[PDB]
């Protein structure tokens, strides 16, 4: 019996090659690897997930869940041709428990709508990223750094429990008591490898007070070293109430953007040392806001925008290769900064973002060895993105960004951030000291490797 027949028993919506439903379901944030799945199935009940997992084993196809579809390597179209993609769009369950300070979120939510739901419900938030079309599933399972993360942690740190359909079909619950091994794996290594997460229970945070957004911006190739050195020096002493990220690109633009959890009249002592050592005359924008306004400002919408915009942020696409790396304190040497900026300037149509971690952050204050997310001792992470609109530049842009990564590697660590997934990173760089434990758990919960992709947790230990 075929795949069409098996999935019709479950009753979920499907889409199969050659149809227009299948063509529009192929949308992905990165359009570089236009992987062609066997079929798309759109579950709305747990049993329909169980059907898809059963049906893929019976027909002998691969299967991956898809949330928001932002995977930088297209792993949510499978990472190869001929996979059953289980698009979790129908899991939008929501509920907020004010007393427990917890929220139940379905694995098909997007960051935009989730922010709105959580604000309307009780003026609370999870510390997620700033791209509103990003699905909570991939984001939370791989880490998740946002502009409140230095106070409240990573999204992954605020997972209290998950429920997933396992490879053998059982509906499983993982939390600090039930199934600790699986609960450990999914906070950091949860993408695809251990099954299909259907819902999260998040620890949520009060953001009813006013916050302050700030951004200092330049457009001058000559001040890049100075502005970046001042960011590093400043970065080492930022208290947890600020989360900030630095931006740089080959056209000469540089900026510092951040969010202070506090009143705007308290801000200047906290950003004074950055401005003093940065170049003069920064484009200065400081604004006091409530939380939903901040989410909008952080995605280039003016603060007067209707909050309901978050339910309908347009899904945009790119075609790019992306790499990441971590940098430990006190940062890159002065030679490393020059080497980095020079490498960057040999190219164009690329951008580089530096999310601040640091020793004051909730992120680095976790006890090591209690999650699959291991990057608890860096100053910041570097996101490296090189884009193209014409396929003739794909080789030059991919070599450009890979050279850049090698230049910086001399001056930094060999770890990288798994939400900026990169097919050319060894798994040791994502999981390090916790990889053995992840592989043991992979053997236990999926011995047949039903759930795999080019960077899924393997079944074979390193000797
Ligand atoms: C496109 C995009 C990505 C961003 C942006 N900004 C970020 C930010 O401000 N902070 C960050 O920490 N990260 C940012 N990123 C990167 C994202 O964090 C990652 O791209 C996320 O991993 C994306 O998650 P998602 O939208 O769900 O993408 P998918 O491609 O659907 O899935 C990724 C990965 O996870 C597996 N998976 C998905 N769904 C499940 C479920 N339900 N259960 C188990 N496993 C799941 C997929 O199979 C795949 O492997 C800004 C922008 C614009
Ligand atoms: C699936 O595996 C889990 C853990 O190994 C087990 O508890 C459950 O009973 C299994 N279900 C089956 C084999 O149907």
């Amino acid at each position: 019996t075929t795949l069409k027949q098996c999935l019709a028993k479950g009753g979920a919506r499907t889409a199969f090659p050659g149809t227009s439903e299948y063509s529009t379901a192929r949308l992905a944030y990165n359009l570089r690897e236009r992987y062609a799945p066997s079929a798309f199935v759109f579950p709305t009940t747990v049993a329909q997930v169980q059907n898809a997992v059963f049906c893929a084993k019976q027909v002998g196809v691969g299967i991956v869940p898809r949330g928001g579809g932002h995977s930088y390597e297209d792993y949510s179209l499978g990472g190869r041709d001929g996979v059953l993609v289980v698009d979790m769009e129908g899991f939008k369950q929501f509920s907020y428990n004010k007393a427990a300070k917890t929220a139940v979120v379905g694995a098909g939510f997007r960051l935009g709508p989730l922010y709105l739901a959580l604000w309307n419900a009780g003026k609370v938030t999870i510390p997620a990223g700033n791209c509103p079309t990003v699905g909570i599933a991939g984001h939370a399972l791989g880490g998740g750094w946002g502009f409140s993360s230095r106070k409240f942690g990573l999204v992954t740190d605020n997972i209290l429990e998950v429920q997933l359909v396992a490879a053998n079909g059982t509906v499983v619950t993982a939390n600090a008591q039930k199934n600790k091994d699986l609960y450990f794996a999914i906070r950091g290594a949860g993408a695809t490898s251990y099954g299909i997460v259907t819902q999260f229970t998040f620890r949520v945070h009060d953001v009813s007070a006013p916050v302050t957004h700030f951004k200092y911006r330049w457009n001058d190739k000559a001040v890049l070293f100075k502005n970046f050195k001042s960011f590093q020096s400043w970065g080492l002493n930022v208290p947890a109430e600020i989360s900030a990220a630095f931006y740089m690109d080959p056209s000469g633009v540089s900026w510092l953007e951040g969010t202070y959890l506090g009143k705007k009249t308290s801000l200047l002592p906290l950003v004074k040392t950055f401005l003093a050592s940065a170049a003069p005359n920064p484009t200065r924008v400081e604004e006091e806001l409530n939380w939903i306004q901040l989410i909008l400002v952080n995605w280039n919408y003016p603060s007067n925008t209707n909050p309901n915009q978050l339910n309908n942020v347009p899904f945009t696409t790119n075609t790019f290769k992306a790499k990441s790396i971590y940098v430990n304190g006190p940062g890159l040497s002065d030679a490393g900064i020059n080497a980095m900026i020079n490498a960057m300037n040999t190219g164009s149509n690329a951008y580089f973002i530096y999310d601040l971690y640091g020793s004051q952050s909730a992120i680095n204050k976790v006890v090591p060895g209690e999650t699959a997310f291991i990057h608890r001792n860096s100053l910041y992470s570097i996101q490296m993105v090189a884009s193209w609109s014409n396929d003739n530049n794909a080789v030059t842009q991919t070599s450009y960004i890979t050279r850049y990564w090698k230049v910086v590697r001399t001056y930094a660590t060999g770890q990288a951030y798994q939400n900026y997934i990169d097919r050319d990173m060894p798994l040791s760089a994502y999981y390090g000291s916790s990889l053995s434990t992840l592989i043991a758990g992979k053997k236990k919960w999926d011995p047949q490797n039903v759930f795999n992709f080019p960077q899924s947790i393997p079944l074979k230990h390193h000797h």
Side-chain angles (χ1 to χ4, degrees):
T1 57
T2 61
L3 195 66
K4 239 142 180 171
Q5 305 181 330
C6 191
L7 296 166
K9 295 182 186 280
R13 175 162 62 88
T14 59
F16 281 80
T19 71
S20 79
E21 302 81 31
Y22 176 93
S23 185
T24 81
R26 295 181 78 160
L27 193 62
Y29 179 73
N30 204 349
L31 299 182
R32 160 168 60 76
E33 298 303 328
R34 280 182 162 102
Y35 293 129
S38 318
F40 292 101
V41 59
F42 301 79
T44 61
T45 72
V46 159
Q48 298 196 321
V49 179
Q50 269 159 326
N51 164 271
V53 177
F54 175 88
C55 287
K57 294 194 282 181
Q58 182 192 288
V59 181
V61 284
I63 179 187
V64 306
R66 180 221 256 163
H70 272 257
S71 168
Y72 287 179
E73 290 283 25
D74 285 307
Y75 285 167
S76 54
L77 294 178
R80 75 274 200 190
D81 285 340
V83 160
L84 174 72
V85 174
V86 187
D87 185 331
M88 293 301 274
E89 173 164 31
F91 285 63
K92 302 239 183 91
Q93 59 259 45
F94 181 86
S95 77
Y96 161 50
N97 179 326
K98 175 181 181 154
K101 276 306 177 213
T102 80
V104 164
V105 191
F109 247 103
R110 255 86 162 171
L111 284 208
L114 176 60
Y115 276 135
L116 193 50
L118 281 168
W119 173 251
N120 290 342
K123 286 177 173 44
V124 285
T125 202
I126 59 158
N130 75 320
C131 303
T133 69
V134 156
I136 183 63
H139 193 63
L141 293 174
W145 185 107
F147 284 115
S148 46
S149 273
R150 296 190 76 245
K151 183 69 162 154
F152 304 148
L154 307 172
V155 189
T156 211
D157 291 324
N158 288 292
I159 298 183
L160 277 165
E161 175 186 291
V162 285
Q163 303 192 2
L164 59 97
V165 175
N168 70 3
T170 303
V171 180
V172 185
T173 297
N175 57 54
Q177 287 79 45
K178 200 181 174 255
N179 291 315
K180 313 203 253 165
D181 56 326
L182 183 61
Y183 181 56
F184 170 97
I186 64 101
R187 292 130 82 214
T192 291
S193 286
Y194 300 87
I196 299 172
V197 172
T198 53
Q199 69 154 48
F200 295 88
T201 290
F202 282 108
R203 168 57 45 82
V204 290
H205 300 266
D206 175 51
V207 289
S208 52
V211 300
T212 309
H213 173 265
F214 59 98
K215 182 162 166 183
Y216 316 114
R217 182 168 182 162
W218 294 259
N219 187 10
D220 187 338
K221 263 169 158 158
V223 311
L224 295 180
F225 178 98
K226 193 189 181 56
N227 293 0
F228 189 80
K229 189 165 169 23
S230 184
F231 162 69
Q232 276 197 172
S233 289
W234 173 79
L236 282 152
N237 303 114
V238 175
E241 287 77 28
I242 290 170
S243 293
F246 190 97
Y247 172 103
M248 183 184 303
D249 72 42
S251 93
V253 179
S254 35
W255 72 60
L256 176 62
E257 195 184 4
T259 301
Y260 173 47
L261 297 175
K263 289 152 176 188
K264 170 165 156 191
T265 72
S266 295
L267 178 69
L268 253 54
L270 294 179
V271 307
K272 151 188 53 192
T273 51
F274 165 67
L275 291 152
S277 299
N281 304 308
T283 294
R284 194 194 116 263
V285 169
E286 300 154 349
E287 180 177 17
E288 189 168 303
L289 299 177
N290 61 29
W291 184 250
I292 211 66
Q293 282 171 306
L294 169 87
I295 307 284
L296 281 162
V297 170
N298 269 340
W299 201 243
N300 306 298
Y301 283 110
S303 38
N304 57 327
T305 289
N306 184 7
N308 294 321
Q309 180 69 99
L310 293 180
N311 286 317
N312 284 305
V313 184
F315 195 90
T316 51
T317 68
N318 195 17
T319 314
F320 61 93
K321 175 62 195 189
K323 299 170 85 70
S324 66
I325 206 170
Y326 280 100
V327 178
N328 290 340
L332 300 184
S333 72
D334 280 16
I337 301 189
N338 283 313
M340 189 185 70
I341 295 164
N342 292 338
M344 180 178 73
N345 284 334
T346 70
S348 63
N349 199 7
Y351 66 90
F352 305 81
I353 295 181
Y354 307 75
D355 296 344
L356 182 64
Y357 285 63
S359 81
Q360 307 90 354
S361 68
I363 312 166
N364 285 24
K365 271 167 146 53
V366 174
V367 185
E370 303 207 338
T371 65
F373 194 93
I374 61 165
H375 318 296
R376 316 285 200 166
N377 199 63
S378 54
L379 186 52
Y380 56 83
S381 68
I382 304 181
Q383 182 187 180
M384 318 161 185
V385 185
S387 301
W388 59 95
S389 70
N390 171 15
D391 167 70
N392 288 317
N393 308 133
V395 175
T396 79
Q397 286 301 83
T398 294
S399 290
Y400 164 68
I401 208 68
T402 291
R403 278 184 303 254
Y404 179 93
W405 189 95
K406 290 181 183 171
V407 173
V408 174
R409 171 69 181 92
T410 297
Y411 304 102
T413 81
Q415 328 156 34
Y417 177 45
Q418 48 268 41
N419 266 315
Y420 305 148
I421 202 55
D422 181 354
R423 196 183 189 148
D424 311 321
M425 294 294 305
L427 288 203
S428 63
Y430 287 127
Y431 301 118
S433 276
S434 298
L435 187 52
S436 320
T437 305
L438 291 170
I439 286 164
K442 177 59 173 177
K443 267 162 137 163
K444 171 170 176 179
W445 295 94
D446 190 6
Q448 316 315 315
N449 200 41
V450 183
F451 296 120
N452 59 76
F453 61 98
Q455 264 159 328
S456 60
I457 305 298
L459 280 169
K460 300 177 300 183
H461 284 286
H462 289 270
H463 208 292

